[PDB]
Structure formats: C-alpha cells, structure tokens
Design a protein around this ligand. Structure first.
Ligand SMILES: Cc1cc2nc3c(=O)[nH]c(=O)nc-3n(C[C@H](O)[C@H](O)[C@H](O)COP(=O)(O)OP(=O)(O)OC[C@H]3O[C@@H](n4cnc5c(N)ncnc54)[C@H](O)[C@@H]3O)c2cc1C
Ligand SMILES: O=c1nc2n(C[C@H](O)[C@H](O)[C@H](O)CO)c3cc(O)ccc3cc-2c(=O)[nH]1
Length: 454
C-alpha cells in the first residue's frame, strides 16, 4: 500500500473494536481516487475485517433545494452499484450524524471509524456529537485537497502569492497516482428511490419558479455522477483547455471545465483531474491558468475556512479592509434591494440581473460574473454584514457547487478583499476592488450575455 501518513488525522482516541471498518462518507462521494476510502480499506485489511460505507441523509437540504438534492442522490445511486461491484456495502442513514452514526457504530460492532475532511462549521458540529457517542478510534483523511489542509500551511495565508510557494513545494511529495481500490475478500455479514421521492415532495413547495408557474431550473446542463464527471473532464482536456487561459474571463464562451458541481460533491477527485491536465499537451499559459485555479484558489479556500472560525463573517476580513469598510459605513448607498428583489433579479442593472438568471436557471454562474454579482451586493446593501448574509444565502440556495469553502472564500474575496490587495478608495466600498459595469463593456460582450438570459 502506498498511503502517505500525513493525509490522515486522529479525531479521537479509542480502544479498537472487532467489527467492520466504517467509512463515514460525506465530502467525497466517489469510489475511485478517494484517499479516505483507500485508507479505510487498508486499515480493514490490516485488521482482517471488511470495510463498509455509511452515508447520512441529514435534516437539512430543506435549506437548499431540489437541484442539489437530486444532483447528489442521483450520484449516490450510481455509487451503490459502483461500490457493490467491489463487494463494499453502503448504508444510507436518515437523520443527523450525531444520532445515526453513533447508533450505527454500536449496532454493527464497528472496529474503527473514518471520515473525509471538510473545514465547514457543520461538519465539526457533527464531529463533536459523534465523538460523544462512540468509544472506538476516530480518523479523518484529507481526500479533497492534493496537499492536505493541515500540511499545506501552519496558518491562514493572506494572499495567493504566499500560499502558492508552500503548495508548489509540496506537489512532489503529494501529487501521484492512486492505488486501485482493492475489493473486499467476501460480501460481508428504504431505498434511495423512496428517499429521493420523500425529500423531493418535502422540498417541492420551495422550488424556484418563473411567474408562469413552470419550473425554473434546467437539469440537462450537468448530468450527475462519477461516470459523467470523467466525461466532462475529458471534454475539457480535449476541447476547452487550449483556449482556457485566453477565454476563462469571458462569460459568453463555454470554455470553463464545468467541474465545480462534480468536485463539490466529490463525484470527481481534483488530484485525478490535476494528474490528467499535467499529462496533456496544450497551449502554453492555459495549463498554468487552470492549475492556479484548481490547486491554489481551491485549496486556499479550505485553508481559509480551516484557519478562520468566523470565515463567513466580517471579522475575518483583513485589517485594511475592515478599517476601509468601517470608514464608509455611513455613506449613502446608491441603491438598496430587499432579498426577494436580488433573488428575482429585479435591479436597475441588466448585467447583474442576467448573472442572477444564469444562476437561477442553470445552478452555475460563470466565474467572472460571480465576482461582479457579489461585489454589487456589497454596493447595494444596508451594510457589509448584510451583504455577506445575502450573498451566502443566494449562493447556497441556488448554486450546484454552493455550500462550499470555495463559496465562503469566494464571497469573502468579493466583499472584503480576502486574498486580495488594497485598491483605489471609493465611497461605500472603500478600497475593496471595484468591478464597474463599464469595465465589462470593455472586457466582453455584455449584451450577448444578457440575451442568453431572459
Ligand atoms: C462570489 C463568488 C462565489 C463563489 N462560490 C463558489 C461556490 O459556491 N463553489 C465553488 O466551488 N466555487 C465558488 N466560487 C469560485 C469559482 O467562481 C467557481 O469555482 C468556478 O466558477 C466553478 O466553475 P468551473 O468548474 O467551470 O471553473 P474552472 O475555471 O473550470 O476551474 C476548475 C476548478 O477550479 C476551482 N476554482 C476555479 N476558480 C476558483 C475560485 N475562484 N476560487 C476557488 N476555487 C476555484 C473550482 O473548484 C473549479 O471547479 C465563487 C466565486 C465567487 C467570486
Ligand atoms: O454527509 C452528507 N453530506 C452532504 N453534503 C456534502 C457536504 O459538502 C459535506 O457534508 C460537508 O463538506 C462536510 O463533509 C451536501 C452538499 C450539498 O451541496 C447539498 C446537500 C448535502 C447533503 C449532505 C448530506 O445529507 N449528508
């Protein structure tokens, strides 16, 4: 087995039991290229026990909507089949992790517990509870980042150009092929259709609809699951990669990878993706541009959430920005929109409303327009605290890749200059990098973007 010990972290001591090794899957919903699954199999081998997979359908998802819930569970049904063809049983527990994972460990005489890693507050909520209801050893493995989150840095990194040296210096040690997942020796000692049916009915009153009372979301932009995530990656390498560096900041092109929803649910590994992109021969500049995103910005987001408890609040902005935004707290805002208005794209700005339409109808706003979109919320909000609330809310309710450290870090960047520099000082937004509507007229084909979305 080729398993780096620095990818793993003890969450609780225990006395090991004598039953299956239980992998509690959460962030990384895949069978292939999954260090958490791979380490859980290795421990089960070393203990002559089978490895099983447990997943919690939590009392939440009523906070998001059908788009995300469907994307995830369609992926998971494919995952049962996948893990079956490995003789690895998957149990799907309804309810919150505290109660259900504790009970599952007791009832199935688990030996050791392993989970994947996520810096989000809620996961730690779950962890705190699970830790009370078990007396067996507990491990988490960083299956999401290429360089483990507690390895990459010992602290918060204020700019990309400080985290980047540290991260690149560790790629030799941490970027490499996955061993194949070795199946179970034997097959060991209600369904997602019913559960998908039950939840959808519970969520259908909150579904987003255009006045016409017809549904607003379009499923077909992203086929969910592990097999489809490979295909999308392959389409990217083959077709969009060469142009990426040139056209990534242009909302009128389909030249992005479109991997974020897949990467969010962990239906595809970012280590895998990075390995394929490294292999490929493409226009100079492109490969550097894309790796800068999927290694530096993706992994600094986990860094941000992990070293900042208040990663979703003003207090985590850098000094200069807080000082700056405080000084402009009482400036009169040129507009103030209610939440409903932002949500239904009813602002005096045709480009903002279009970006909000792309979101509502596809569940994926273009990266470039996300920055415009979020900065305008700062500008048209009672306060910077309210701006974060509104952005976090809209991002999490409607993005397929939402509810993600990339989100909080991305919104903090936009609204408080996290991982950014001081810029020209203005009214209302202070020194926070400004993104004028006109700057977009210079930079890309605005009117065409607006036509695409109405
Ligand atoms: C206001 C705002 C909100 C955001 N919310 C989210 C979110 O909820 N979930 C999310 O995954 N990303 C978020 N981002 C970052 C980024 O916009 C998206 O990850 C990207 O557009 C996803 O599309 P893609 O896969 O085609 O990107 P590509 O250009 O094809 O990049 C490939 C991968 O690199 C990573 N990546 C690219 N850009 C960034 C970035 N700026 N920050 C962190 N990682 C990046 C993503 O994981 C992405 O899947 C947000 C950015 C902003 C400004
Ligand atoms: O373990 C779970 N992870 C879920 N996740 C994954 C989430 O990324 C992780 O729970 C955290 O990263 C902590 O592991 C969701 C993500 C979404 O975007 C939307 C809904 C869910 C729902 C669940 C869930 O019910 N259980």
């Amino acid at each position: 087995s080729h398993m780096n010990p620095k990818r793993i972290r003890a969450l609780k001591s225990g006395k090991q039991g004598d039953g299956p090794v239980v992998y509690w899957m959460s962030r990384d919903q895949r069978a292939e290229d999954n260090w958490a699954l791979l380490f859980s199999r290795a421990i089960a081998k070393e203990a002559n026990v089978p490895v099983v997979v447990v997943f919690c359908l939590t009392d939440e998802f009523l906070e998001a909507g059908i788009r995300q819930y469907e994307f995830m569970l369609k992926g998971l049904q494919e995952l049962e089949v996948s893990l079956s063809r490995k003789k690895i049983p998957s149990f799907f527990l309804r309810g919150d992790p505290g109660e259900k994972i504790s009970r599952f460990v007791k009832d199935y005489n688990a030996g050791t517990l392993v989970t994947d890693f996520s810096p989000l507050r809620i996961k730690n909520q779950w962890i705190e509870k699970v830790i009370s209801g078990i007396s067996i050893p507990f491990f988490e493995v960083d299956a999401h980042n290429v360089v483990p989150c507690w390895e990459a840095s010992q602290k918060h990194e204020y700019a990309a150009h400080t985290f980047r040296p540290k991260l690149y210096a560790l790629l030799p040690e941490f970027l490499e092929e996955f061993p194949e997942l070795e199946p179970n020796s034997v097959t060991p000692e209600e369904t997602l259709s019913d559960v998908l049916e039950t939840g959808v009915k519970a969520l259908l009153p909150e579904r987003a609809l255009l006045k016409n009372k017809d549904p607003l979301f379009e499923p077909w932009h992203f086929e969910p699951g592990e097999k489809a995530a490979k295909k999308v990656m392959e389409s990217f390498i083959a077709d969009r990669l060469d142009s990426y560096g040139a056209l990534r900041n242009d909302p009128t092109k389909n030249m992005l990878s479109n991997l974020s929803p897949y990467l969010h649910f962990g239906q595809i590994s970012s280590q895998r993706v990075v390995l394929e992109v490294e292999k490929a021969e493409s226009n100079p500049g492109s490969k550097k541009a894309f790796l800068d995103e999927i290694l530096i910005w993706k992994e600094i987001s986990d860094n941000f959430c992990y070293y900042n408890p208040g990663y979703d609040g003003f207090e985590s902005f850098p000094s200069w920005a807080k000082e700056s935004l405080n000084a402009h707290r009482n400036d009169v805002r040129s507009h103030i929109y209610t939440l409903e208005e932002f949500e239904a794209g009813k602002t005096h700005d045709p480009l903002w409303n279009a970006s909000q339409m792309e979101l509502l109808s596809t569940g994926k706003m273009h990266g470039y327009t996300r920055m415009y979109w979020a900065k305008k919320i700062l500008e048209w909000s009672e306060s910077p605290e309210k701006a974060l609330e509104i952005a976090i809310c809209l991002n999490d309710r409607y993005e397929l890749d939402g509810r993600d450290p990339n989100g909080y870090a991305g919104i903090a960047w936009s609204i408080g200059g996290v991982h950014d520099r001081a810029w020209g000082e203005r009214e209302v937004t202070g020194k926070i990098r400004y993104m004028s509507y006109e700057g977009c007229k210079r930079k890309f084909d605005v009117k065409l973007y607006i036509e695409k979305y109405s």
